[PDB]
Ligand SMILES: C=CC1=C(C)/C(=C/c2[nH]c(Cc3[nH]c(Cc4[nH]c(OC(C)(C)C)c(C)c4C=C)c(C)c3CCC(=O)O)c(CCC(=O)O)c2C)NC1=O
Ligand SMILES: [Fe+3]
């Protein structure tokens with residue numbers, strides 16, 4: 594359903610150079626998970642019915658950073674500002690989505706296709722569109738399905754993004770990594786979810802909801818058994834998420 598806009602050759606050159614600078618920066622700073630969260634949070638405010646929110650640069654606004662669900666993302670925005678300044682031609686919207694794609698790549702994940710041309714929009718979406726980690730499958734479908742327009746497959750695949758990173762008691766209140774290797778992108782999020790709760794690892798109520806849902810569970814099983822299948826479905830879902838409201 595996508596018709597990607599034309600951008601100048603200079604814009605394309607900047608995308609390519611910024612991608613490389615982002616790899617080095619994100620790897621050195623060890624901030625891939627935070628950058629993936631920034632990109633996803635960013636994108637996850639899209640409401641299909643109204644065509645509002647989405648990955649349009651608004652997360653840099655103090656007003657959106659102040660949203661409770663975005664606790665700690667001000668760190669991400671600050672970290673990227675010096676690099677962003679080297680690429681004045683790029684929209685923030687594109688830059689943050691490129692950072693999310695790079696975060697996945699430099700931790701060993703799939704190569705998520707990237708298309709430039711998102712415009713920076715003036716108005717942040719209203720607060721309260723991002724999902725509540727204490728809720729379950731009905732809520733997940735309300736947010737990913739009814740608002741964003743993503744599929745049940747996309748929900749489970751994207752949940753696997755938690756294979757990198759950790760919660761912080763000072764941010765959400767939850768604490769700790771989902772996996773034993775929080776800077777490695779692999780299917781361990783699903784392996785861990787299946788094995789039960791191991792000491793030192795985190796499972797949110799929203800993660801556990803995947804295990805008991807008739808549609809979500811076979812997907813968890815598939816991804817735990819087949820990392821290639823996870824990578825394919827993840828790449829599809831991340832691309833879709835990063836393009837919500839963009840190019841149709
Ligand atoms: C399925 C719904 C879902 C919920 C409710 C969710 C909630 C959630 N996600 C994160 C961290 C968190 N989330 C993510 C990727 C992420 N998150 C996300 O869901 C949203 C909300 C965007 C829809 C998507 C679609 C993606 C990527 C594909 C990373 C990489 C980290 C680690 C951050 C770090 O290490 O600092 C925290 C801890 C924040 C903190 O305390 O530092 C919480 C409470 N994440 C979820 O996926
Ligand atoms: Fe998350």
Ligand code: NA
Pocket residue numbers: 756757772773774775776777778779781782
């Ligand atoms: Na991992």
